[PDB]
C-alpha cells in the first residue's frame, strides 16, 4: 500500500503544516501537525476542556462505529516549546492520503496548552518520530508510521515541504519526479528516539564550506533551524544590523535586508536554503526588526533541522531495519 496527502502552511509565515487526516467511521477529518520530532497522535475532542478550544475541528469518538476506548490509557506530552496537552486514548481508523490503518492510537485531549488553544488551525499532532517516544501510559502505543510500515510498498516515508506554497507527505514510496538530482542518503541514530543525523558542515552565502560535524534531528514539527551558537554568530555576522536581541528571543535584523542563503552537508551533497526562506518577517505587526530564522540552539540541547531546513529538500525518512534519511535538492 501506499498513502499521499497535501501538506499546506498554516500561515504567510510557513509557521507550521497541516495535513487532512480521516479519523473514525464515517470518517472525520481533521488537520494534523505531522511532528518527526515526537511520536504522539492527539487530536482536540469532544473530551477538550471547552475554554481550551477556539476554532478547532474536534473528533467525536461517540460518533465513530470504530472507537474503542482502550480502558486505562493516558498520555501527557510537553514540547520543546514549552506548550503541552495530555489526556485519555481511543483506538479507531486513521487514513492518510488513502492509507488505512485499522487500531491506531488516537490521544483525546482533555486539556491542552494555551499556543494550541490559540492555533485555531491545528486540530492536533500526528508524530512521526520512533515509537520510543509515545508518551501512552501504562502501554505505550505505536505512531501510525510503525503501524503502517509492514504494509507499506517500502517502508519509508517523505517530507516534500513547500516554501509559502504545499507540498506533500507521501507514505511507502518515493516519487522520483519530485526531485532533482540524487538522493544522499546519511546514518540515523534512534538513541534518542529521533530521526537523528551528523551534517557534514555548512557555508553561509557564497562562503567557502566548512567541513563540521553537526548532530542534530530532522523534525518537520519545528518550524526553525536551530544550530551551534558558533554557527548561527557566523551566519548572521554577514547581515548588516543582525544582533541577537534577549529581549525578542533570538536573532534578529533589519527588514530592509536581503539575507544570504545557508547551505547544509549531507555526506558529500550540499542543501542550499535560499536567503527569503530565512525571513521569519517584523517581530510585531508593522515593526522594521524582522526575526531570523536560523537560531542558536545553545540550551535547547540539541541542533534541530527545522522547516527552514527541511523545506529546501525533498527528505527521505528510511525506517527499514536500520534506518537512515536521504535528502535531495529540488
Not at 501527557?76 to 491506531?104: A, E, K, M, P
Not at 531570523?292 to 540539541?302: D, L, P
Request: proline fraction near 4%.
Amino acid at each position: 500500500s501506499t498513502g499521499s496527502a497535501t501538506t499546506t502552511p498554516i500561515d504567510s509565515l510557513d509557521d507550521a503544516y497541516i495535513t487532512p487526516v480521516q479519523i473514525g467511521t464515517p470518517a472525520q477529518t481533521l488537520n494534523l501537525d505531522f511532528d518527526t520530532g515526537s511520536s504522539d497522535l492527539w487530536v482536540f475532542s469532544s473530551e477538550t476542556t471547552a475554554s481550551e478550544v477556539d476554532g478547532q475541528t474536534i473528533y467525536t469518538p461517540s460518533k465513530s462505529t470504530t472507537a474503542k476506548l482502550l480502558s486505562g490509557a493516558t498520555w501527557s506530552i510537553s514540547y520543546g516549546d514549552g506548550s503541552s496537552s495530555s489526556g485519555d486514548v481511543y483506538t479507531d481508523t486513521v487514513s492518510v492520503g488513502g492509507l488505512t490503518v485499522t487500531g491506531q492510537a488516537v490521544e483525546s485531549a482533555k486539556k491542552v496548552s494555551s499556543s494550541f488553544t490559540e492555533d485555531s488551525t491545528i486540530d492536533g499532532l500526528l508524530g512521526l518520530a520512533f515509537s520510543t517516544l509515545n508518551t501512552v501510559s501504562p502501554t505505550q502505543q505505536k505512531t501510525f508510521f510503525d503501524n503502517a510500515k509492514a504494509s507499506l510498498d517500502s517502508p519509508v516515508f517523505t517530507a516534500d515541504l513547500g516554501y509559502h506554497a504545499p507540498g506533500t507527505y507521501n507514505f511507502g514510496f518515493i516519487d522520483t519526479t519530485a526531485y532533482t538530482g540524487s538522493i544522499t542518503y546519511t546514518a540515523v541514530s534512534t538513541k534518542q528516539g529521533f530521526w537523528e543525523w551528523t551534517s557534514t558542515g555548512y557555508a553561509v552565502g557564497s562562503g567557502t564550506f566548512k567541513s563540521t560535524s553537526i548532530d542534530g534531528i530532522a523534525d518537520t514539527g519545528t518550524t526553525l533551524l536551530y544550530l551551534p551558537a558558533t554557527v548561527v554568530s557566523a551566519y548572521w555576522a554577514q547581515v548588516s544590523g543582525a544582533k541577537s536581541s534577549s529581549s525578542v528571543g533570538g536573532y534578529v535584523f533589519p527588514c530592509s535586508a536581503t539575507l544570504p542563503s545557508f547551505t547544509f552537508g549531507v555526506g558529500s551533497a550540499r542543501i542550499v536554503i535560499p536567503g527569503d526562506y530565512i525571513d521569519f518577517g517584523p517581530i510585531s505587526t508593522g515593526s522594521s526588526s524582522c526575526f531570523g530564522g536560523i537560531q542558536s540552539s545553545a540550551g535547547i540541547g540539541i541542533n534541530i533541522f527545522g522547516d527552514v531546513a527541511l523545506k529546501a529538500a525533498f527528505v527521505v525518512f528510511n525506517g527499514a531495519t536500520t534506518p537512515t534519511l536521504g535528502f535531495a535538492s529540488k
